[PDB]
Design goal:
By secondary structure, the chain is mainly beta. It has a single domain, classed as Trefoil (Trefoil (Acidic Fibroblast Growth Factor, subunit A)). It is 0% helix and 38% strand. The strands form 3 sheets. Strands 3-2-1-10 form a 4-stranded antiparallel β-sheet, with no helix packed on it. Strands 4-5-8-9 form a 4-stranded antiparallel β-sheet, with no helix packed on it. A two-stranded antiparallel sheet has the order 6-7. A hairpin with a 3-residue loop joins strand 8 and strand 9. It is found in: Secreted; Cytoplasm; Cytoplasm, Cell cortex; Cytoplasm, Cytosol.
Length: 131
């Protein structure tokens, strides 16, 4: 959590991106300004995910859609969970009982919460600290 990180999924080989207009998607461009993220932990295993460039927070709405919020609240808290020792997954804490994950489709668009589950490539992120 000390360094900014990139979150990479092998589903379509995308980095999680929070665009300045509040749109969330994926890009293969590792030099994109808006894929530089900062994780911060409330409690152990509970994180905010923030754009280092814009300060916006990752959030998930009641339809399971990801978007960027200028400031955080309970809709921005995610449960960070280890899978297969090397990947992290992120579950909406607000919708933890719906098992709604942060995920990206192969085409780089957001995979909505309702369509996600453990073990999907879409939700498996490699956390890459920035040098």
């Amino acid at each position: 959590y000390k360094k900014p990180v990139l979150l990479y999924t092998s589903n379509g080989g995308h980095f999680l991106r929070i665009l300045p207009d509040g749109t969330v998607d994926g890009t293969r461009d590792r030099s994109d300004q808006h894929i530089q993220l900062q994780l911060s932990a409330e409690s152990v295993g509970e994180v905010y995910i923030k754009s280092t460039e814009t300060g916006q927070y990752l959030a998930m709405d009641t339809d399971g859609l990801l978007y960027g919020s200028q400031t955080p609240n309970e809709e921005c808290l995610f449960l960070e969970r280890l899978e297969e020792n090397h990947y992290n997954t992120y579950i909406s804490k607000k919708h933890a009982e719906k098992n709604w994950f942060v995920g990206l489709k192969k085409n780089g668009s957001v995979k909505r919460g309702p369509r996600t589950h453990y073990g999907q490539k879409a939700i498996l992120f490699l956390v890459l600290p920035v040098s």
